[PDB]
Design a protein around this ligand. Structure first.
Ligand SMILES: *[C@](O)(C(=O)NC1CC1)[C@H](C[C@@H]1CCNC1=O)NC(=O)[C@H](CC(C)C)N1C[C@@H](NC(=O)OCc2ccccc2)CC1=O
Ligand SMILES: *[C@](O)(C(=O)NC1CC1)[C@H](C[C@@H]1CCNC1=O)NC(=O)[C@H](CC(C)C)N1C[C@@H](NC(=O)OCc2ccccc2)CC1=O
Lengths: 303, 303
């Protein structure tokens, strides 16, 4: 019992974090096998960052201009290339702590663990969702660029995020490990705005199931609805439209609780229209959308 | 920018978690040097748990009745003793992954990271406070007993909590690593109730400073107050009384923001009396008390 925002254990990722320095700029890199991954803006001077030509800035850079440091030890850079918005530095030593891993580009609404790092050293770990507007609600200071997001499947680390930037609303944007931004963001110091911050409906439903599993059922009402009827109300509150695929994903939680998804949708509809009347659900006063159905099942079944 | 509930990186603690089995009961233990620590109720049958005599139950137990398993490997138990509500199992192998560590009994209002474990394997990591009523708001299932809470000071792990039980309100209770419960709880299957859940005032103040640091200052009003005036309102809302020691601890955040602690107390007073008017502070609709002043400074300064 109880329900918390829970990160993956970070040990396997801690052993991959290094410091990368190019001139005066020090950020985080990810050391897997004989390659270090880091944001390409490590090569920028404070003036370059205004409107950089990365191709031109790389003409000026050689292997020896990248200092890679793994705790107290200097790694030897024997190659470098740019892939989209990431630099890949080939080093002469395979990381002996390299876990089983893969690179994934995550879908909007999916969650991952962030290991916030400074100067190649772990600060802390917390869970984030890739929001529909391709931003995340993180906690990142100067020095955090190159911090990574990940999931763990038993022993395999799925790396899905590399931290690059902060946006006006105090939210964050970054790339997959192939250097492609989530969203329409670019790695330059120009004003960029997040689009409408739509709510992940299927995750709100999942969290309401979690509330029922933990004995909090005050908000279950006597109504049901239809997908089309619910979605008319969703669009009004900038909720993602619910589809049969979403209903299917909530199936195991519906089965566990004996509450049909469309009955839970009806309860969600009345919470949207009437608010919580100063009551709380799993210790929250607002509707939480950063738990996936899998996060709920995992937590409630001890995976 | 941004502000999140952040756990310590868990790698150094992951390497200490083992499975302990006594008969049909399997729980978590903590392997440091040549000693495994676990809850003494590992020795209880499902009937024993109703009113156990632990001293008598231990007459029946020998070294060979404790199965300790570290991943795939069986450790050899060469000694056992009970210290308060914990068992200490002496094994013939020092844990080679033992970090620098200490055992601390934490004060009410202080925070720590929990590594939730099942069958000796890490499930996830999240931050908790030791509440004034000596309970924590965790996420624990059957199998989680022996999961530990900790802080990290640079390289040194301070272990402060071992998980034993759940309470009616869906909150949790456990011991320090010397086997002494936080609070008046006992390790037996009898109905136990948490006392009044008082709010950690100094931590709410800290979180309001965090809000100001992150540009959220809508709730700063034109008033100041006195310790005694504030405390009259505190006691009404079951807040901890504020003392000069609390003011001194908030000093660095006051200095950082240029908001005198007693001005922030006046803002807190009006939030208690008037509520948030459906507004939010750092993405929350209620007053958060599980961040210490140190948690705020650490997060806002990249420690
Ligand atoms: C990382 O580059 C970083 O940590 N660098 C290490 C060397 C110190 C940094 C992380 C940010 C900084 C604060 N919190 C974070 O997450 N990222 C940047 O500074 C971004 C640099 C670009 C990728 C080149 N960056 C640029 C900045 N953009 C900006 O100022 O645009 C103009 C603007 C005008 C008005 C209002 C707002 C913005 C945001 C950003 O993160
Ligand atoms: C741990 O013992 C555990 O994980 N054991 C491993 C072998 C499976 C367990 C953890 C709990 C279980 C669910 N979530 C948790 O955190 N702890 C217990 O089961 C406690 C056992 C005692 C320490 C011996 N325990 C006893 C139970 N008490 C109880 O039922 O009292 C009567 C009551 C009456 C009415 C209403 C409520 C309670 C609570 C508890 O955690």
């Amino acid at each position: 019992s109880g329900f918390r925002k829970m990160a993956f254990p970070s040990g396997k990722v801690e052993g991959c974090m290094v410091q990368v320095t190019c001139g005066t700029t020090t950020l985080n890199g990810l050391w897997l096998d004989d390659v270090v991954y880091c944001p390409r803006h490590v090569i920028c001077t404070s003036e370059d960052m205004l409107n950089p030509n990365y191709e031109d800035l790389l003409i000026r850079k050689s292997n020896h201009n990248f200092l890679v440091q793994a705790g107290n030890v200097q790694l030897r850079v024997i190659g470098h290339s740019m892939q989209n918005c990431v630099l890949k530095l080939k080093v002469d030593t395979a990381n002996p702590k390299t876990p089983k891993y893969k690179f994934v580009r995550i879908q909007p609404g999916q969650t991952f663990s962030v290991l916030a790092c400074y100067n190649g050293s772990p600060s802390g770990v917390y869970q984030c969702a890739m929001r529909p507007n391709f931003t995340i609600k993180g906690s990142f200071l100067n020095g955090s660029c190159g911090s990574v997001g990940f999931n763990i499947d038993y022993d395999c680390v799925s790396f899905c995020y590399m931290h690059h930037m902060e946006l006006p609303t105090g939210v964050h944007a970054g790339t997959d490990l192939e250097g492609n931004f989530y969203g329409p963001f670019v790695d330059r110091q120009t004003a960029q705005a997040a689009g409408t911050d739509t709510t992940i409906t299927v995750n709100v439903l999942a969290w309401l199931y979690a509330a029922v599993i933990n004995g909090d059922r005050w908000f279950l009402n006597r109504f049901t609805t239809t997908l089309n009827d619910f979605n008319l109300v969703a669009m009004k509150y900038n909720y993602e439209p619910l589809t049969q695929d979403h209903v299917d994903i909530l199936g195991p939680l519906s089965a566990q609780t004996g509450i049909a998804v469309l009955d839970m949708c009806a309860s969600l509809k009345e919470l949207l229209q009437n608010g919580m009347n100063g009551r709380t659900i799993l210790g929250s006063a607002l509707l939480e959308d950063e738990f996936t159905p899998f996060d709920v099942v995992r937590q409630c079944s001890g995976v």
